[PDB]
């Protein structure tokens, strides 16, 4: 398939994987180092049929394995990691599929570069959803 950069066999060609793991879905998005070009984007909802399971670790692992397949056709063999939670005024805790997706990429044979946490952190914020009494569940 080739479709890759003119480099020596075995050389590390680096992409950036953006892992957005909320509590409803997991995103496995592979771009370049500028972020402008996207080689591939597979989500957990692309892998399951029930809404309740799109955020499951198994769905994230399945989506990560799909990404490694396509990355090989692109020529990308190494990835810098940028993981994020919902952020903003919402929760900053990463979703269940964040750890599963990263582990799946490592086991699938793709080299892991630098890892960073890039959830949007406001230095001050608008009002969060819900009343002053919070979500009454």
């Amino acid at each position: 398939k080739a479709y890759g950069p003119n480099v020596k066999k075995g050389d590390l060609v680096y992409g950036v994987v953006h892992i957005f793991a909320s509590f409803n879905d997991t995103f496995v998005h592979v771009t370049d180092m500028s972020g402008r070009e996207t080689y591939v984007k597979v989500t957990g909802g692309m892998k399951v049929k029930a809404d309740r399971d799109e955020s499951s670790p198994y769905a994230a692992m399945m989506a990560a394995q799909d990404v490694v397949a396509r990355c090989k056709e692109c020529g990308i063999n190494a990835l810098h990691v940028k993981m994020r939670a919902v952020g903003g005024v919402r929760t900053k805790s990463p979703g269940p599929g964040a750890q599963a997706a990263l582990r799946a990429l490592a086991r699938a044979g793709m080299k892991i570069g630098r890892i960073e946490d890039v959830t949007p952190i406001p230095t001050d914020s608008t009002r969060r959803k819900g009343s002053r009494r919070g979500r009454r569940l």
Binding site: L12, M83, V89, T91, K92, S93, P94, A98, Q99, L102, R103, A106, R107, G109, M110, K111, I112, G113, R114, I115, E116, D117, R128, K129, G130, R132, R133, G134, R135, R136, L137
Partner: protein, 104 residues
């Protein structure tokens, strides 16, 4: 009724200040005064021990010398949310006055 806490459950003495601006609870978003909310600063590893060792094998940068990044986040809870998540539990009347000044 009877006064449960001399503190009244917050950190605002009678002549220290009038109003402390509220914060949104970490879980449910309830507005609670910042001196009253249960505040925990947690340092969390990005991956567990099994997952960290797998990612380290495939990482030319991370290994025995370079530690992997951690998660730093100050969490402030509503009283109800802190009790439900078990970060704080009801205590016997005698033990209610026990205070901790550092993470243990």
């Amino acid at each position: 009724m009877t006064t449960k806490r001399r503190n009244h459950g917050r950190s605002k003495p009678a002549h220290s200040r009038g109003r402390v601006k509220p914060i949104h609870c970490f879980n449910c978003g309830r507005l609670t005064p910042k001196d009253k909310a249960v505040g925990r600063f947690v340092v969390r590893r990005m991956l567990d021990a099994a997952s960290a060792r797998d990612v380290a094998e495939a990482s030319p940068v991370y290994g025995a010398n370079f530690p992997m990044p951690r998660l730093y986040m100050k969490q402030r809870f509503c009283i109800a949310c802190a009790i439900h998540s078990r970060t704080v539990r009801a205590r016997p009347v005698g033990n209610r006055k026990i205070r901790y000044t550092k993470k243990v």
